[PDB]
């Protein structure tokens, strides 16, 4: 008698996958679902990239010499480096990380004058710690000094209204002198007090002059503070010394992504997911490369591999 | 293993069958012939691709750094950030392994199903002129030539043409 | 598509069949008659409703504001709150689209299954007095009247009453 | 001759998605993501307090606008954008934690702290809290030297929480607009306030000096707060610049607090709120507002996700 | 319910059948005999165990306290910690109830499937020498003895040995 | 003659849940949520240190209660509710972050900071840290002027972390109970302490003045801390009111820290702890405590979720 037989295909060496029900069941063809391949570069093709180099992101606001090329940049993608420094004259930013986070997503910054002018004080205090050609200072700030050494610094009030349509970023510094003598030399004697107010902000500051070790040959410190001024609100500063005034306000330009990286930039590859050691370029839904990747990333998972069957149960002889 | 076809009552697959997932091997007077079915091969492949296109999807969702690899953030908020990120890694890792296990179960059983749909269909074609032996074969109880096979293949084989013939047997 | 019935070897469905999901269309001497099966229609519907009641569930779980729409919270904790909330939106959105895709697969295959359970049952009833043509039909090999149909329907049709008759006719 | 079984079908069905295919038409399908907002606050059956011009934190200290809310009860507390915490300019330190506590409080019940005072004033007022002429925070006492420039004595006041539930305690530090003004109010010399309990310990120095005028005042008051556990004691010590609490607050029970821009409606029942209304729905998910609170469907990205309730639809 | 076997056209199960999930009850000349199938019982059990081993898994993942039961943390970070922990409890609870519902669906339908694989196989063995009555039984149309049963059981029953006999016996 | 196949069944099976129906009886089912607590801390095979009356932060500064814990080793650290960080009253600034570092430390190893001092006292004590008569924190030195009222010199001390792992550095600011007392201890005039490294920069001014007596002391000490990276240097500068560290701390390895109210048991093995004992289980989920730590089944709302291990049960 005659016969006809139907049947399915098979290959000699298939791949093991996992099921609800069994482990390492061989199938005909299977495909990988977890990204394991890194590109050891920052793939920036088609993106306005600013690599901050020796400039610290926070420096772009206040303007130490090493940030001179970055006072007014534009970017879709901002790259911080480990050598980056925010500061010439020793000091710190209060609430630095929140500020970095704002700046990373800013699209870059556009600077506008605060329109302050000053009577019967100095405006041009400098230091050998910010070297441009001889002593200088933060480019966006003014070190306000008594008219002569020891002189009384007047009670001052300066105010600024955000007339633009977007929120403004406002910085100022408090100077902590290396000695009490130095304070009174710069600003005259007596208690100093700085206040800063708006409709959503209210704080006051007293310098603490006195001895710190020398850092960059300075015993004083400057502490920067900041705030966002909403359209149509006004900042008011009041102060009788020890106050580092802003000369320019900063406006955020648009939208961007900020990353910290240790690797070269590459304008030839296209990527949207970044970490310190490169770019994750992939279509897969998951990745096991770096749990701290940012951008538009496959989700990070523990497992090194998860294979998705694309074939049937594979049966040989 | 859901339907019994693949790795069930069919003993195995054919490593010579390059041009399909499912097909036919026949034995009659003239010779022995093999050709793979298109309609059902296409069918399965299409369900697999439809799975893939769903996963090889890209999330349009952007995340930024809350964290700092160069100057560590203050320690308490650092610990909250880490605990949350670790908790998310648990959720995703569980989701990942589960999704893949489940899709695999279904892909395998998708295949059992389509085989056992080829079968049950051909069976239906042949009415009473043949028999289930049970290794994925039909013993035909009438002499038949290679143009009779093709008519089973492309689904034209008429039964009441060979009915009586195949019956006494 | 799992079982081969719906959108498989049955060619299509009947837009005239208002009173059920599954039913019968017959042709005999007297006339042509249609009536929908209750026992299996009920059966599927019940599995669908059982799906629904599971999802149309209400979470008894309360959440409060950690956030402030009127005076923004400080920016660092603001950013942690937002990043976490966005991470949960990812999880829930994935869960949502996954649950719905999967329930749908299953609902469709639930239906293929019940059809192909009506079939295989009627087939079993009729023993050897009829044949699978393969478009979801049984050619009966004996004359039969409209009270013979109803006995198939409500599951009383006796085979060894019409056996011999229908067998020579084969 | 024959009998044929078969399934039903409709002429225009709905597209859904499956594991396997996209836009597969089925007979009947149903929506699973809520898209419909009710542009009102649905408060039927709930004890509602809508704070209006009163700021939640005002309920504690008691500027004139909050006079009707010093001792309220609520299941549902509604903050408004016009709400103000303050008459005399100043801020709350740690305001958001305090809001969060207050939102879930079920309202507050006030008890006297039982302080009395010798050989100082107790009734300092300001034209910035207007009741009929100058007044002050209703729950606070502005403590002043007996006469202008006089020495304010070193004081200690302590309060024990003898009730069975934790007490909320407030006080303020006054930053005068000038040093002169400080010594006028409190006498000359360094001022120091300390506040101690078994789980709390902090000290405060005022910073007198020039601020712009806000509500015609150059000084500022800063409020601080703590929770006093049953049976614990707060102790304040101070030689001026100190705004004393007259009453402690106790939380009444349980409530929900929301911020809203829309009207209240006691006719509709809802348990999920956002600034723009109520989400009333049984569906598991919602695409209306990612910040909704209460008992809410989970928020998702997608505008729609249809659940098949029918079979494969195959027409002619 | 998927395949129609269990709680379908088989009316019920046998509370006397201690040594398996699936088996045989026969009636012939000699007597009535019951013995449970190994090959398919083993098969199902193995798929159940394979489910279990996947869940009775231990997470190698460590978590530490971010929280303090003895001196409460500051209230704002306390509230964020609580809100996140509550959000995770939502996710896990949903995942838990969903996983278990789904596995159960599948476990039940795994069983329907294996029954309806025993059936369809025995059916295939007997070719044309018997009939589907439809309550999970085969009426044999030839006399058969208890060594004929065993040969169906351990899968050796030859058809073309009893063919003719049972065929006229269907008319 | 006939043969019939069929499946098994039991007379009373268990209800489970499915995608599709609720309470469908199956032959055998199994539990998936842990409900069983072990009311003890299962520490078998683990180096356990149970801190008792010593507070975790005490192990750093060294009040008398913590004398046995200055240099411990552990895989598992157990805090108790009676634990106390402090002899002389005061607090740690940023205490919780410091607890969190200490809990996971593997214990601590102490190294001298190599400070020596000229023309001051080094040996200030207090009756609040009792060893045999007045004493002080064992790891700290209370620096005092040479005689009462004398000027305390402007000092600078610096320490370089030359080891290969990060060092924990602690110091305190003393706020005296009165201004007289400050000048008695440290001489008159303004006091300022600064603390610098490459990743740290802060300055501190004491606030002398009246606090209630706690343990018979009106002054307070506030401890502050930092991590010094290998090869970095801390520098302190100060002219009084400064409590100097004598020893830096190095983290030993890795550990788990838990807070508990129950006994230790070295007979049972567990890796998931909470305040009320150990969760010992293989199940993927648990309904015992949402705050468990270690390697734990995931916490869920539900009391029970049964996993079918049998088939659909249909009986006679
Ligand atoms: C507020 O309280 C003070 C302190 O008791 C009031 O008392 C006056 O004090 C003066 C001298 O300090 C005494 O001669 C009188 O006993 C008080 N005067 C009067 C008219 O009663 C003080 O008057 C109060 N101020 C206001 C505006 O009510
Ligand atoms: C195997 O799977 C991959 C991924 O889907 C596919 O690209 C490839 O074409 C497949 N190869 C074969 C031989 O089936
Ligand atoms: C800075 O400005 C002052 C005051 O106008 C001026 O007299 C002085 O010479 C300036 N110093 C330098 C170095 O330009
Ligand atoms: C902003 O505020 C000013 C003064 O407060 C008011 O007159 C007006 O409403 C606003 N002006 C503009 C240009 O937005
Ligand atoms: C948190 O985890 C990251 C990476 O997962 C680690 O590198 C970092 O040191 C950790 N931060 C803290 C504060 O423990
Ligand atoms: C966080 O996102 C919300 C919207 O969900 C936005 O309105 C808010 O301004 C954001 N907060 C911060 C701190 O960026
Ligand atoms: C379609 O689905 C809805 C939602 O479950 C159901 O209530 C309704 O009865 C169905 N409509 C029809 C016409 O069957
Ligand atoms: C309050 O304090 C006492 C004595 O210190 C303590 O023993 C007791 O538990 C407390 N009293 C009440 C009524 O709770
Ligand atoms: C957070 O929840 C815990 C219980 O999980 C509770 O005891 C604690 O008081 C809550 N903390 C805050 C800050 O609300
Ligand atoms: C502490 O040290 C000083 C400095 O030499 C010493 O003279 C003094 O007597 C000491 N005090 C005690 C109680 O040992
Ligand atoms: C630390 O830095 C110093 C700079 O004098 C250098 O000599 C040394 O190599 C460094 N030590 C280590 C252990 O890295
Ligand atoms: C359920 O009881 C069965 C039937 O006797 C037994 O085999 C099994 O041990 C139980 N289930 C589990 C998961 O142990």
Automatic annotation (TrEMBL), chain B:
Glycans are attached at residue 82. It is found in: Host apical cell membrane; Virion membrane. It comes from the Viruses. Disulfide bonds join 144-148. In natural infection, inactive HA is matured into HA1 and HA2 outside the cell by one or more trypsin-like, arginine-specific endoprotease secreted by the bronchial epithelial cells. One identified protease that may be involved in this process is secreted in lungs by club cells. Palmitoylated. Signal peptide: none annotated. Binds to sialic acid-containing receptors on the cell surface, bringing about the attachment of the virus particle to the cell. This attachment induces virion internalization of about two third of the virus particles through clathrin-dependent endocytosis and about one third through a clathrin- and caveolin-independent pathway. Plays a major role in the determination of host range restriction and virulence. Class I viral fusion protein. Homotrimer of disulfide-linked HA1-HA2. Belongs to the influenza viruses hemagglutinin family. This is Hemagglutinin. The lineage of its organism: Viruses, Riboviria, Orthornavirae, Negarnaviricota, Polyploviricotina.
Automatic annotation (TrEMBL), chain E:
This is Hemagglutinin. Homotrimer of disulfide-linked HA1-HA2. Glycans are attached at residue 82. The chain holds residues 342 to 512 of 562 of the full protein. Signal peptide: none annotated. It comes from the Viruses. Disulfide bonds join 144-148. Binds to sialic acid-containing receptors on the cell surface, bringing about the attachment of the virus particle to the cell. This attachment induces virion internalization of about two third of the virus particles through clathrin-dependent endocytosis and about one third through a clathrin- and caveolin-independent pathway. Plays a major role in the determination of host range restriction and virulence. Class I viral fusion protein. Binds to sialic acid-containing receptors on the cell surface, bringing about the attachment of the virus particle to the cell. This attachment induces virion internalization either through clathrin-dependent endocytosis or through clathrin- and caveolin-independent pathway. Plays a major role in the determination of host range restriction and virulence. Class I viral fusion protein. Responsible for penetration of the virus into the cell cytoplasm by mediating the fusion of the membrane of the endocytosed virus particle with the endosomal membrane. It comes from Influenza A virus. Belongs to the influenza viruses hemagglutinin family. In natural infection, inactive HA is matured into HA1 and HA2 outside the cell by one or more trypsin-like, arginine-specific endoprotease secreted by the bronchial epithelial cells. One identified protease that may be involved in this process is secreted in lungs by club cells. The lineage of its organism: Viruses, Riboviria, Orthornavirae, Negarnaviricota, Polyploviricotina. It is found in: Host apical cell membrane; Virion membrane.
């Amino acid at each position: 008698g005659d016969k006809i037989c139907l049947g399915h295909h098979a290959v000699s060496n298939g791949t093991k996958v996992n099921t609800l029900t069994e482990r390492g069941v061989e199938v005909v063809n299977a495909t990988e679902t977890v990204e394991r391949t890194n590109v050891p570069r920052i793939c920036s093709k088609g993106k306005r990239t600013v690599d901050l180099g020796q400039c610290g992101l926070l420096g772009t606001i206040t303007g130490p010499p090493q940030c001179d090329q970055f006072l007014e940049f534009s970017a879709d993608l901002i790259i911080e480096r480990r050598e980056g420094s925010d500061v010439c004259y020793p000091g710190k930013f209060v609430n630095e990380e929140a500020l970095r986070q704002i700046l990373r997503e800013s699209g870059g910054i556009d600077k506008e004058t605060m329109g302050f002018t000053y009577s019967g004080i100095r405006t041009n205090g400098t230091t050998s710690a910010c070297r441009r050609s001889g002593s200088s200072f933060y480019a966006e700030m003014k070190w306000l000094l008594s008219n002569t050494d020891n002189a009384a610094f007047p009670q001052m009030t300066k105010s600024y209204k955000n007339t633009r349509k977007d929120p403004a970023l406002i910085i100022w510094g408090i100077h902590h002198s290396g000695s009490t003598t130095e304070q009174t030399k710069l600003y005259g004697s007596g208690n100093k007090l700085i206040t800063v107010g708006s409709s959503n902000y209210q704080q006051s500051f007293v310098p603490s002059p006195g001895a710190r070790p020398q850092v960059n040959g300075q015993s004083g410190r400057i502490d920067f503070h900041w705030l966002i001024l909403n359209p149509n609100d006004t900042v008011t500063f009041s102060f009788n010394g020890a106050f580092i005034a802003p000369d320019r306000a900063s406006f955020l330009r648009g939208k961007s992504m900020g990353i910290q990286s240790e690797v070269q930039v590459d304008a030839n590859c296209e990527g949207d997911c970044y970490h310190s050691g490169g770019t994750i370029i992939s279509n897969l839904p998951f990745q096991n490369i770096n749990s701290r990747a940012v951008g538009k990333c496959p989700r990070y998972v523990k497992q090194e591999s998860l294979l998705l069957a694309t074939g049937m149960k594979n049966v040989p002889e | 293993g859901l339907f019994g076809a693949i790795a069930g009552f069919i003993e195995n697959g054919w490593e010579g069958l390059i041009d399909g997932w499912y097909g036919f091997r026949h034995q009659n007077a003239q010779g022995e012939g093999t050709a793979a079915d298109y309609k059902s091969t296409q069918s399965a492949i299409d369900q697999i691709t439809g799975k893939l296109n769903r996963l090889i999807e890209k999330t349009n969702q952007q995340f930024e750094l809350i964290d700092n690899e160069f100057t560590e953030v203050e320690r308490q908020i650092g610990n909250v950030i880490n605990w949350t990120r670790d908790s998310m890694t648990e959720v995703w890792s569980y989701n990942a392994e589960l999704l893949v296990a489940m899709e695999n179960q279904h892909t395998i059983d998708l295949a059992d199903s389509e085989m056992n749909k080829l079968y049950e269909r051909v069976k239906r074609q042949l009415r009473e002129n043949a028999e289930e032996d049970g290794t994925g074969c039909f013993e035909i109880f009438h002499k038949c030539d290679d143009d009779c096979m093709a008519s089973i293949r492309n689904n034209t084989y008429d039964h009441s043409k060979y009915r009586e013939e195949a019956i006494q047997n």
